[PDB]
From a paper:
B12 is obtained from food and travels from the stomach, through the intestine, and into the bloodstream by three B12-transporting proteins: salivary haptocorrin (HC), gastric intrinsic factor, and transcobalamin (TC), which all bind B12 with high affinity and require proteolytic degradation to liberate Cbl. B12 uptake is a finely orchestrated process involving a number of structurally related high-affinity B12-binding proteins, which protect B12 and carry it through cell membranes via specific protein–receptor interactions. Like the previously elucidated bovine and human TC-Cbl structures, recombinantly expressed rat TC consists of two domains: (i) an N-terminal, disulfide-bonded, α-helical six-hairpin glycosidase-like α-domain and (ii) a C-terminal β-stranded ubiquitin-like β-domain, the two linked by an interdomain loop. In the shown structure, Cbl is sandwiched between the α- and β-domains of rTC in a base-on conformation.
In this paper, we present the complex crystal structure between rat transcobalamin (rTC) and GSCbl. We obtained crystals of rTC that diffracted to 1.2 Å resolution at pH 5.5 in the presence of GSH and to our surprise we observed continuous electron density emanating from the Co of the Cbl ring system corresponding to GSH. GSH binds at the β-axial site, located between Cbl and the α-domain of rTC. Therefore, most interactions are formed with residues located in the α-domain. The Co–S bond is approximately 2.4 Å, the Co–dimethylbenzimidazole base bond is 2.2 Å and the corrin fold angle is 6.6°, which is defined as the butterfly angle between N21, C4, C5, C6, N22 C9, C10, and C10, C11, N23, C14, C15, C16, and N24. The majority of the 14 polar interactions between GSH and rTC are formed through solvent molecules. However, direct side chain interactions are present between Ser195, Thr198, and GSH. The strongest interaction is found between the α-helix dipole of α6 (Tyr154 and Tyr155), which interacts with the carboxylate of the γ-glutamate group of GSH. When the β site of Cbl is occupied by a strong ligand such as cyanide or GSH, the TC α7/α8 loop is disordered (bovine TC) or folds outward into the solvent (rat and human TC) and forms little hydrogen bonds with the rest of the protein. Our structure of rTC in complex with GSCbl clearly displays the broad specificity of TC concerning β groups of Cbl.
Author numbering: 15 to 85, 95 to 120, 124 to 427
Write the structure that this text describes.
Amino acid sequence: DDKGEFCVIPKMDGQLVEKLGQRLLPWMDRLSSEQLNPSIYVGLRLSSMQAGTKENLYLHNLKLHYQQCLLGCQTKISGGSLALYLLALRANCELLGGDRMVSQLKWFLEDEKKAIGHHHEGHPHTSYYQYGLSILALCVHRKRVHDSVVGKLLYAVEHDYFTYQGHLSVDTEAMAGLAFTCLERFNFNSDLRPRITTAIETVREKILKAQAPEGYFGNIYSTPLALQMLMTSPGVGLGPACLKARKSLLLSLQDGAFQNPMMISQLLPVLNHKTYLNLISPDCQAPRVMLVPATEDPVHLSEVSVTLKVSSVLPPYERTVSVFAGASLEDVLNRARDLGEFTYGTQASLSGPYLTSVLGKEAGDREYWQLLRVPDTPLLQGIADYKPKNGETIELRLVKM
Ligand code: B12
Ligand SMILES: N[C@@H](CCC(=O)N[C@@H](CS)C(=O)NCC(=O)O)C(=O)O
Ligand SMILES: [Cl-]
Ligand SMILES: [Cl-]
C-alpha cells in the first residue's frame, strides 16, 4: 500500500492490547439476562483474542435471552439491542431466515420511521444510531427494508442532522455509513443507489473533517466506529489519517482509557482490522489468542477531593467529598448519599449504569441527566467508569435531548 489508501493501525503495543482484552474477560461470566451484552460477543469474535468455551456459553445465554424477550422476559428489548444480537449470530456464522426476530426488527424501524414523519420533522423514539444499526443488522442477514425506511437515514446524513454547532456527532454518522455500505454491497434499495453511494462519501468526508489534531475522530470513544467506516474501503488520505488515530489510541490506552466493556467491544474489531461489515461473510475460524485473567492491583491508599453539584433541582445541591484515588463518579455519588440528604437512581444499559434520577427528580421523556466537569465540559465516560481527579467539580444537570 505504497500510496497510503488503506486505513490500518500497525505496531500497537502488544501488552496494552492484551490488557484491553483482559478487561472484557471477567464480564464473560456475568451471564444473567440483566447483564448480557451481545456486543461483547461480537467484539471478541472480531478481535485478535478469544475466551474459549466461555464464548460458547455466552452465546447460548444470549440466544435464550433474546428468544425469551420476543414480543418470561423482564425488560423490553429495544430495536438496537435486538440488532446487536443479530450481529452476534453472524459472528458465529449463523443466518436468520418467516423469522420472528427479523420481523420484529423491521417493525421497530417502521415505528421509528413513523415517529420521524413524512417531513422528517419528528425524531426517533430511540435514536438515529439505533435506526442505522438496525438497518445494518438486517442487511448482514441478507434482509432488505423498504426504501421509505432507508430514505429517512439518507435524508439525515444529507442534511447534516448529526452536526451541532459545527461539531459532528461521529458515532451516529459512522453507524449510518456502515449501514449504507452494507446496502451498497447487496445493491439493496436500488432506486436510492446514487444517494446511498454519495452518502457513503459524505460520511467518510465528514469523519475525516472531524479528526482532531490529536488524531481521534470527534472523541476517543467515537474513534472505533469512525475507524470501522474508514476501514470498509480504501481512499485518499486514509492511511495517513488512520496513523494519526493509532497515536491517539495508544496514548489513550497508556492513560487508562477503554475501561467500559461496550467501548472495548467497539475497539477490539478495528485493532484487528475488522468491522461489522465482516459479518456479511465472516471467518469463523479466525486466528485468536486465548486470554488469561489479569492480576488485580493493590488497594489505593491516597484520596481525592471532589465537589458534586446539582443545580436542576430545588433547592440546588453542592457538597465536597473525599473518596479513594481512582474511585468512580458512582463512588462519589455513593459517598454523598452516605453523608445524607442526597439520593440518585440508575437503570441498567449495555454500557453499564445509566443515571436516571437525582434528588428525587427522574428524567422525563426526551430528557437526560448529563455529567459535566465544571465549567460546562461533558464527561466522556459514565458514572461507573469516570474517575474524578482531585479538586474537580462534577455537575449533574437535567437537559433536553
Ligand atoms: C444515543 C446515545 C445517547 C443518548 C441516549 C438516549 C437515547 N435517545 O437513546 C443520550 C444523549 C441521552 C446519551 C447520554 C450519555 N452518553 Co451517550 N451515546 C449514545 C450513542 C450515540 C448510542 C447508544 C445506543 O443507542 N446504543 C445501542 C443500544 C442498543 O445500546 P443500549 O446500551 O441499550 O443503549 C443505551 C445506552 O447507550 C444509554 N446511554 C447512552 N449513552 C450512554 C453512556 C453511558 C456511559 C451509559 C452507562 C449509558 C448510556 O442510552 C441508550 C438508550 O437507552 C452512543 C454511541 C456508541 N458508540 O455507543 C453514545 C455513548 C455511549 N454515550 C457516551 C456518553 C459519555 C454519554 C454520557 C455519559 C454523556 C454525559 N457526559 O452526560 C451520557 C449518559 C449519562 C447518564 N445519564 O448516565 C459515550 C460513552 C463512552 C464510554 N467511555 O463509555 C458514547 C460512546 C459516545 C461517545 N463517543 O462519547 N447518549
Ligand atoms: N441525534 C443523534 C445522537 C446524538 C447524540 O446523542 N450524541 C451524544 C451521545 S452521548 C454525544 O454527545 N456524542 C458525543 C459527540 O457528539 O462528540 C442520533 O439520533 O443518533
Ligand atoms: Cl471507558
Ligand atoms: Cl433520586
